[PDB]
Amino acid sequence: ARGPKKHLKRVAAPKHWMLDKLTGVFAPRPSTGPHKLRECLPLIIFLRNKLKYALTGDEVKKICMQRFIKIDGKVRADITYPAGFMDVISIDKTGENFRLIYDTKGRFAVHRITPEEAKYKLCKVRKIFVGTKGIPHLVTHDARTIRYPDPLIKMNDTIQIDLETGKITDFIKFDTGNLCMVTGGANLGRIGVITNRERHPGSFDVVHVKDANGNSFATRLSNIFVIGKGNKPWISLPRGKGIRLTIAEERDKRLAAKQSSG
Amino acid sequence: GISRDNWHKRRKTGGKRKPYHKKRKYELGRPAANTKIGPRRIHTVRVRGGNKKYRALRLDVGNFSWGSECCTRKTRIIDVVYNASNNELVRTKTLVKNCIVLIDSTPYRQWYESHYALPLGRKKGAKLTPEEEEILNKKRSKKIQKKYDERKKNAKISSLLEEQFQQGKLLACIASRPGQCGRADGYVLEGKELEFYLRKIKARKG
Amino acid sequence: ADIQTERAYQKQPTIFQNKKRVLLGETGKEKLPRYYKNIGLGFKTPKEAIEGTYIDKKCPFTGNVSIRGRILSGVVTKMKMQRTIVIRRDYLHYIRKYNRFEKRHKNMSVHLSPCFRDVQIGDIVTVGECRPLSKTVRFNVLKVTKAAGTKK
RNA sequence: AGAAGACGGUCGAACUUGACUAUCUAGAGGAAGUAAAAGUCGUAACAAGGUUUCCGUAGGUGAACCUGCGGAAGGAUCAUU
RNA sequence: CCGCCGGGCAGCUUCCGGGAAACCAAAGUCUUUGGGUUCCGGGGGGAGUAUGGUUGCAAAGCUGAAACUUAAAGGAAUUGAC
RNA sequence: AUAUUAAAGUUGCUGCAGUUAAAAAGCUCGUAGUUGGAUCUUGGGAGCGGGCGUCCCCGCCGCCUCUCGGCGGGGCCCGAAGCGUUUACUUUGAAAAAAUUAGAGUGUUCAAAGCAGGCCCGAGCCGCCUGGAUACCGCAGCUAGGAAUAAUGGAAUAGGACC
RNA sequence: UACCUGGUUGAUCCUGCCAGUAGCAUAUGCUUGUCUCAAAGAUUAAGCCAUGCAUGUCUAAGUACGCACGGCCGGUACAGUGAAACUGCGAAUGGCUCAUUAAAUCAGUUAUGGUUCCUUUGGUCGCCACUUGGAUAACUGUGGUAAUUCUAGAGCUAAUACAUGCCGACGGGCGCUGACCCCCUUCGCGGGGGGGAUGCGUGCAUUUAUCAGUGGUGACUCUAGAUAACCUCGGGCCGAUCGCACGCCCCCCGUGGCGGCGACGACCAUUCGAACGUCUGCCCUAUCAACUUUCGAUGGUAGUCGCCGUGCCUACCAUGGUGACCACGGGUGACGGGGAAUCAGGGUUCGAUUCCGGAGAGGGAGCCUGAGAAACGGCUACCACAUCCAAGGAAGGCAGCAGGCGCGCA
RNA sequence: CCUCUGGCAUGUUGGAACAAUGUAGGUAAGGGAAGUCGGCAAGCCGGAUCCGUAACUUCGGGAUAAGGAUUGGCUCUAAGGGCUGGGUCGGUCGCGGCCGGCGCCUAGCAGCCGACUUAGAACUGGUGCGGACCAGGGGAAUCCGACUGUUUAAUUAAAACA
Ligand SMILES: [Mg+2]
Ligand SMILES: [Mg+2]
Ligand SMILES: [Mg+2]
Ligand SMILES: [Mg+2]
Ligand SMILES: [Mg+2]
Ligand SMILES: [Mg+2]
Ligand SMILES: [Mg+2]
Ligand SMILES: [Mg+2]
Ligand SMILES: [Mg+2]
Ligand SMILES: [Mg+2]
Ligand SMILES: [Mg+2]
Ligand SMILES: [Mg+2]
Ligand SMILES: [Mg+2]
Ligand SMILES: [Mg+2]
Ligand SMILES: [Mg+2]
Ligand SMILES: [Mg+2]
Ligand SMILES: [Mg+2]
Ligand SMILES: [Mg+2]
Ligand SMILES: [Mg+2]
Ligand SMILES: [Mg+2]
Ligand SMILES: [Mg+2]
Ligand SMILES: [Mg+2]
Ligand SMILES: [Mg+2]
Ligand SMILES: [Mg+2]
Ligand SMILES: [Mg+2]
Ligand SMILES: [Mg+2]
Ligand SMILES: [Mg+2]
Ligand SMILES: [Mg+2]
Ligand SMILES: [Mg+2]
Ligand SMILES: [Mg+2]
Ligand SMILES: [Mg+2]
Ligand SMILES: [Mg+2]
Ligand SMILES: [Mg+2]
């Protein structure tokens, strides 16, 4: 590589895009954006695979440029704009409005929400700052330098953001006994209260998560993004509920749904 | 061209490293500033990511600071006197970081005399008669004299420095890296250091 | 003298050694104000660093250099470089055809700060990784046990 | 503002010359190995093979070989009062 | 003279058990395979040759190939023939 | 025809040989290497659970700390700390590109493949139900439990604790 | 499926090999109806290349006076399409090949508290201004050369190109300075308390120094703040900027206020990354045993350069550093890995080749542009090959896709 | 090679010319041993410093092998040595002594002297610099004699004698 890389091979593409083999060489490749390529859903895929609205990239292009689509409600004309975790996608003319939230398998579920609720989002803080002249800042995971926060929102905590105004509107401090969804690794999509956080100096920090239905499991803090004040969540969750079933329990639940219900 | 990189020298063991690539514009050097003393001359360089490196080439003014006193006027860089790396830089008179230059005393002098209200650099009665009396002459009384009396056994500057001024340059060390910054800012040798570099210079003179 | 054995004066950066004008002799009792820090991860920044007057930029306590990354134990084999030693880290590499092992040593070079006086060879040493500070060196010495048999 | 030009430096192709190194090949004559063969000279070895063979080592011999010294049994004596 | 004890040199003895066997109380405790560890062989020839190194006064020693060739060469035991 | 794998326990860790078939250095010393005897908390005690008593199974006897923090005097026991004397080992957790591979689901007409399909429905529903799993991923690095084995420390011209 | 058979002998049992047997690639022979997939100039020659193609690009929104088209409207420049040209962006990806390269590449792991980052997203962005200077292209016209994606002179004429540079702003606010003035006490010097014109500074970024200890971390010489100065001076910077669509409201008539995009910039975060570092791991090879070092070997101190940490480089010191746990060298029919073929369990072999990383563009060197190149479908050199020449000169790079020659079993 | 002390009058004559032949010195375009019995003769080489040195070998050598580089002038830097000195505070006796107590440079510092080298740098010239002088040409082979030594005073130095 002489300079930056611009293409993305289909296959080099991430798995959670459900992009198939025989269709092209390439995958889209997101744009530089508010999410890490590896952890996005390029609006193209979102539209003409998951929402099947378009058929090709062209049909995606045409939808995008009646200026319908509205990622965290601000109108985007890129197909490769990476719409990622806890953005919105107000599609407006149809009036569905989504969120993208990790399904238990971990693939950015299609998750419709009510316009009231699609007002607000939820953001993990990556840092506190103090810039010049003693103004303090935040930084959301997804880039939003807020400025002048509550001197209270510390690291790894979350913020419910208004969208229209921006500006932090009410916030939840990462502690034990606090709802969360994991945004990485194997336990991506799963949900529970916390229970335990282990500090290890330097070497980064584990956090166990006790699911509602017993299953304790763990992860590194990095991936834990909170969504509640213990049990009660500050958003809609997609059905599946961030539970995660054993392959056999899953097989049963399919087998019960088949034959009987109809 | 003139490159900086590990690949081209031997290892810990002393084997010969083979090169797998060729030179890379970033594994890269440029020929040196070795800025001399003289009238201002700076050429800016483009570096990685754009940006600038202002290679000094001649220089005269420098923003030196009398540390103790907390004044820092910008002053003539009068000569290079000593340099720890290599005696040749001193002989060529080349300004680089951690040099020991000389800088005009004058702006520090002036400020001592306007702040502390005493003189600096001893003399019979040419400086004392006209200017310092005019600097003094307390038409106010009460407040200003009380302030300058509060500047008590406190003005009490060092012996080496008082000597330097009465000569009238300062030993000064350069803190900037002229070849990259453009400037040649520094600090005035004081106390234990000054005493050390004076002892170094005397020895060199023999 | 004593400290300044070099061509340039050896001052610790950070601290200014010059503001003074009061009674009770010239300078204080301790005279200088020594800069040091603590280096973290649970390590006792020792007495001989803080008490002592020496000066080293490559001291992890009393000089600029962040410990950050891997932490490795070795054992000191030589001490013949100035302010630096070599430690031999030994380990049983696994070959899996023969479900066996092979011994293997890597005498890495290491920066020994002279907070540590009276360190000998055969002395277990725990180095902290840091920024490359010689061509070979990337590890400062942080704690030395020496208690392998031979005396207190 | 500023071109061409030039001192020096710097990287440094490239050439000229040695020096090492790896490989590949020519060669009068020499001296092997193998294989073909319906040759020549013997008869070393296997039966005590007609001088037990065999070892190590020396000298000699047209050739196999012989002899000297000290070994071996894998001998042609597990045994001789 | 008659025992016993340790440790040697061997000997005879047998369905210990092995082994292609002749044989071996070890050559046993091995497809029921692992006490420890060193040296070593990988069809027969070429060949312990050529070459390089090394040692030696020499004689020679230690290290040590290949090209080429070739279906056996070999061990043990049996019946014969001699 | 040639390379190459199995056959080949004819390269042998599993697993081969070395009296006579090919093979143990002429002998002994010897450093590196490899290998190294035995030895320290154990029965018991008390309960939940199973076939007045016996025989099998399951939480307990990480110690100390209060010199530290608090979920004008205190309790209560958690954050810190003498971190597990210091490893190996094991077990758990995390972290682990996809494709491949294994392997769920799914009549591509079968299959190799592929990742989808399937449904209600007279279509008036102007639709709906779903998949796109899981495993493995040496060695090294990281996390917690276990402490048999194997190494390794600690008091011997003396040293551990005490308003 | 955890398999064996033929061959030394007159027969026998062994040791042993040869030979068969079954997979997989490459080639080839002979054959071949149908359908679905699908490898394919790697092995030899990273040998050579005829010809064509493979990187260009315009919206409402950067410059249109071609007149090349055309309006509907004039005369208040501009109306609407628009070749060309200047400007901006891109050409650093993709594609190809596997020559080199053996702790190198590369894989896992870790650092960046040691640096850069076009863009993307989010922050910040208090007397020419009713808007300045001159220049140049296309265009028009003179031309020169045998000849090139050669250009020279003469006319003009644009800007978001290139330059230049103002109103705001509160004789006010806060730091110093302080003409002086006032009140209390005192025998009085003095002591305490107040006020205060006139001056300098009147900071985001940069450079240096000093002082203190809002927010952070296992971890600061961090972030933020105070003081002093400096400006990396026009070639520090934002300071203070150009385009498009609709078109409104004034205790008020001719002025002054206004939403909605576009483009732009300095600093910060953001992403894409990049870049160097940490720990462990690679085939044969001793007919390779010592190797490295004043021409950096391995340390140290000060610098230099570099985006930054480091012998990266220079200077002065010290004498280090690796090695039988195989260094050093040599070889490789060696790009690394994911993987592939074989397989009971163990293994063996292969991996030029569709993903990831790396390298290179006939060979070597240097460099401009630019955020990113030491780019080769960019230059400048030499060498090697080659092409026209009017002999003075000029142009070249298939290991892109096709294609050819050459090499070969391919 | 040039000079001072000291010594001399150019070695048994002078003058004028400057032809050939000579004797002794030089130089030579291009070629470079073709010359000749034969490279005879002359020519190259040469000093020092820094590298770098083969076959072969009696392991001593071969060796200055071979083969390369540098050298002037000037202006600097760095490195190499000697000597002497504190018994200071208190007491007392005559700047000097004697006693007692500190100090005790015990990492030494201070002043004062003195040869001479060597290494590095900058500038500098019409690339010239061991500027004269002095001063090895190399290599591959064979024959002989080991070697060093000796030998025919007046033709033989050799492989002869030792
Ligand atoms: Mg590419
Ligand atoms: Mg195994
Ligand atoms: Mg016949
Ligand atoms: Mg045996
Ligand atoms: Mg066995
Ligand atoms: Mg053989
Ligand atoms: Mg095989
Ligand atoms: Mg097998
Ligand atoms: Mg065998
Ligand atoms: Mg035999
Ligand atoms: Mg034998
Ligand atoms: Mg033996
Ligand atoms: Mg034991
Ligand atoms: Mg037969
Ligand atoms: Mg076979
Ligand atoms: Mg980044
Ligand atoms: Mg090769
Ligand atoms: Mg390249
Ligand atoms: Mg080519
Ligand atoms: Mg290039
Ligand atoms: Mg090309
Ligand atoms: Mg004469
Ligand atoms: Mg005469
Ligand atoms: Mg005479
Ligand atoms: Mg001539
Ligand atoms: Mg001739
Ligand atoms: Mg002739
Ligand atoms: Mg001659
Ligand atoms: Mg010679
Ligand atoms: Mg002869
Ligand atoms: Mg002689
Ligand atoms: Mg004679
Ligand atoms: Mg003679």
Side-chain angles (χ1 to χ4, degrees):
Chain A
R2 277 221 228 67
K5 204 84 81 181
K6 271 160 206 187
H7 281 94
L8 181 67
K9 303 278 164 84
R10 195 76 80 118
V11 94
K15 194 62 166 153
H16 88 330
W17 286 3
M18 323 257 91
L19 275 184
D20 87 72
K21 273 168 160 205
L22 276 62
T23 16
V25 164
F26 296 95
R29 195 174 225 291
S31 223
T32 41
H35 300 301
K36 284 188 204 298
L37 138 49
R38 195 90 303 173
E39 192 214 306
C40 313
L41 227 185
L43 196 69
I44 180 172
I45 297 168
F46 186 81
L47 239 68
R48 78 106 158 73
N49 304 30
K50 268 125 197 177
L51 286 186
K52 285 159 175 155
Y53 273 81
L55 281 160
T56 84
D58 272 34
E59 304 270 301
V60 165
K61 174 57 70 188
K62 279 144 180 175
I63 298 154
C64 105
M65 259 144 174
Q66 262 88 292
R67 305 188 76 261
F68 293 141
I69 304 170
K70 223 182 177 177
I71 304 158
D72 54 292
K74 236 209 78 221
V75 182
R76 253 67 184 199
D78 198 348
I79 78 190
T80 48
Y81 179 102
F85 184 63
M86 301 283 279
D87 278 328
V88 171
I89 306 190
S90 168
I91 204 165
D92 177 43
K93 188 175 190 160
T94 21
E96 276 138 41
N97 324 334
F98 303 93
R99 218 179 269 259
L100 303 100
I101 285 164
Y102 287 102
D103 186 84
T104 179
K105 270 90 161 212
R107 316 183 265 201
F108 287 125
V110 156
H111 190 226
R112 292 164 168 76
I113 56 162
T114 49
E116 186 161 34
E117 199 216 322
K119 261 64 175 184
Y120 75 83
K121 83 151 52 183
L122 230 62
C123 283
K124 209 180 150 194
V125 283
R126 297 301 191 67
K127 45 186 175 202
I128 288 72
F129 229 127
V130 183
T132 192
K133 299 171 189 165
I135 295 95
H137 303 82
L138 285 179
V139 196
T140 60
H141 67 114
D142 58 334
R144 308 117 153 286
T145 318
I146 312 288
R147 73 200 229 90
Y148 297 127
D150 311 344
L152 268 116
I153 294 153
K154 238 67 94 171
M155 289 269 306
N156 303 311
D157 307 342
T158 73
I159 342 168
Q160 198 190 268
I161 294 177
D162 200 272
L163 279 291
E164 204 87 322
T165 309
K167 287 199 185 188
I168 67 182
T169 61
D170 24 289
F171 81 91
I172 320 90
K173 231 283 281 178
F174 173 84
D175 296 279
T176 55
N178 266 103
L179 236 185
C180 126
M181 169 141 41
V182 191
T183 79
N187 310 332
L188 181 74
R190 284 219 276 234
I191 285 182
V193 313
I194 278 147
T195 316
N196 187 20
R197 143 86 180 287
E198 292 189 52
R199 292 100 204 284
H200 313 70
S203 183
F204 231 71
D205 305 287
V206 97
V207 173
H208 294 76
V209 157
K210 194 143 223 166
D211 174 51
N213 297 67
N215 280 288
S216 190
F217 69 78
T219 333
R220 51 194 300 140
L221 208 171
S222 156
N223 302 340
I224 281 148
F225 155 87
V226 333
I227 60 174
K229 282 196 160 179
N231 290 285
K232 193 168 144 190
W234 282 41
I235 41 157
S236 47
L237 308 117
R239 63 106 207 289
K241 233 74 196 171
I243 294 276
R244 177 89 136 264
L245 283 55
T246 54
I247 54 181
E249 182 69 9
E250 192 214 337
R251 183 262 306 294
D252 162 74
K253 291 279 187 180
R254 189 274 302 267
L255 218 77
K258 196 139 269 92
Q259 311 294 5
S260 185
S261 189
Chain B
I2 189 168
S3 57
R4 287 171 41 109
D5 30 3
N6 253 67
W7 78 318
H8 80 280
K9 28 151 52 209
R10 298 184 175 286
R11 302 106 159 286
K12 207 161 102 96
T13 61
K16 274 220 77 70
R17 264 200 272 252
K18 285 304 203 297
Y20 80 102
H21 58 65
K22 63 189 67 264
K23 286 173 220 193
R24 305 306 224 202
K25 194 226 139 277
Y26 66 85
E27 284 165 57
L28 145 78
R30 270 174 270 268
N34 45 262
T35 168
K36 315 311 187 203
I37 296 159
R40 184 95 83 105
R41 194 201 289 258
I42 312 199
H43 294 49
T44 193
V45 179
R46 156 156 181 155
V47 299
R48 212 96 185 292
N51 317 350
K52 287 183 179 280
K53 247 180 203 163
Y54 304 80
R55 189 121 299 135
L57 303 177
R58 300 182 170 290
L59 231 23
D60 41 30
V61 291
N63 183 240
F64 293 88
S65 310
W66 196 357
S68 69
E69 260 55 85
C70 205
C71 37
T72 166
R73 265 75 261 166
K74 147 242 172 171
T75 318
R76 189 167 65 190
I77 288 157
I78 130 93
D79 183 37
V80 169
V81 103
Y82 182 55
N83 182 216
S85 323
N86 189 0
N87 254 236
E88 266 178 57
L89 282 203
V90 186
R91 195 182 73 175
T92 325
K93 296 164 184 206
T94 304
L95 299 142
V96 323
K97 194 195 196 303
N98 248 285
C99 267
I100 313 284
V101 315
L102 308 160
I103 69 178
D104 215 336
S105 64
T106 41
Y108 301 107
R109 149 189 221 72
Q110 170 163 302
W111 175 97
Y112 194 68
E113 298 195 81
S114 179
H115 184 293
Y116 293 84
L118 319 185
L120 210 55
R122 187 267 183 228
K123 210 164 188 175
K124 293 178 182 179
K127 177 167 93 265
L128 296 171
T129 358
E131 305 299 323
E132 271 254 73
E133 239 173 38
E134 189 172 308
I135 291 284
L136 270 294
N137 281 9
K138 311 313 211 82
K139 71 208 73 112
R140 305 171 96 238
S141 196
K142 292 160 67 266
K143 263 62 180 179
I144 39 166
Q145 278 231 19
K146 180 178 164 188
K147 269 210 299 191
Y148 291 8
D149 289 9
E150 202 190 335
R151 303 216 217 277
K152 215 166 158 279
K153 296 297 184 186
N154 190 67
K156 186 76 67 174
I157 189 186
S158 175
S159 321
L160 292 317
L161 274 149
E162 188 205 321
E163 171 60 69
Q164 240 142 245
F165 287 107
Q166 93 166 293
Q167 261 55 305
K169 320 155 209 285
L170 297 191
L171 251 87
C173 166
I174 314 262
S176 32
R177 287 174 73 233
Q180 327 259 279
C181 74
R183 311 200 166 79
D185 309 347
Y187 53 78
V188 188
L189 274 313
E190 268 206 289
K192 204 79 184 179
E193 297 256 1
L194 174 52
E195 146 271 281
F196 167 85
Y197 286 121
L198 292 158
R199 177 177 83 215
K200 282 283 182 285
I201 293 157
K202 160 159 267 104
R204 180 237 189 78
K205 107 90 191 182
Chain C
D2 199 88
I3 306 127
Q4 261 79 261
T5 183
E6 294 93 340
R7 226 73 153 281
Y9 188 120
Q10 280 291 280
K11 49 157 146 34
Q12 269 203 110
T14 320
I15 59 278
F16 182 54
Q17 56 227 232
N18 273 130
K19 265 185 167 282
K20 189 68 172 180
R21 209 317 80 182
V22 286
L23 298 170
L24 212 166
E26 287 113 308
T27 202
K29 293 182 265 65
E30 277 78 303
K31 306 196 173 182
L32 269 152
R34 181 164 200 88
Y35 169 69
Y36 64 101
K37 85 197 102 147
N38 86 87
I39 176 261
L41 305 303
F43 275 106
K44 300 282 293 183
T45 177
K47 251 279 277 198
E48 277 300 327
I50 296 170
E51 174 252 309
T53 198
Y54 81 113
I55 141 157
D56 188 46
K57 61 208 253 178
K58 296 159 183 184
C59 176
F61 311 107
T62 74
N64 128 253
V65 41
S66 70
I67 300 293
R68 39 133 270 239
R70 309 189 168 277
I71 275 85
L72 311 177
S73 143
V75 70
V76 177
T77 208
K78 295 140 168 157
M79 294 199 278
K80 281 183 133 76
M81 303 127 105
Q82 71 201 124
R83 311 159 166 288
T84 154
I85 61 169
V86 198
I87 90 175
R88 181 176 157 281
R89 320 195 326 94
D90 349 326
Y91 60 101
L92 274 167
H93 169 226
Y94 187 72
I95 278 85
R96 92 197 174 136
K97 172 163 171 203
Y98 311 65
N99 302 65
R100 301 302 179 74
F101 287 82
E102 100 174 51
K103 289 197 78 167
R104 283 182 190 229
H105 84 140
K106 296 274 212 65
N107 46 1
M108 56 140 69
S109 293
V110 159
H111 193 285
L112 187 297
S113 176
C115 64
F116 310 118
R117 302 171 308 134
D118 296 26
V119 168
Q120 251 87 297
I121 65 124
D123 283 356
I124 298 304
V125 57
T126 327
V127 297
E129 165 182 7
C130 63
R131 74 189 223 273
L133 81 190
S134 88
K135 174 178 193 299
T136 72
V137 182
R138 297 92 170 78
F139 284 86
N140 284 32
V141 177
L142 275 57
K143 93 186 289 305
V144 178
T145 72
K146 60 69 181 150
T150 310
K151 210 160 184 69
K152 286 282 179 120

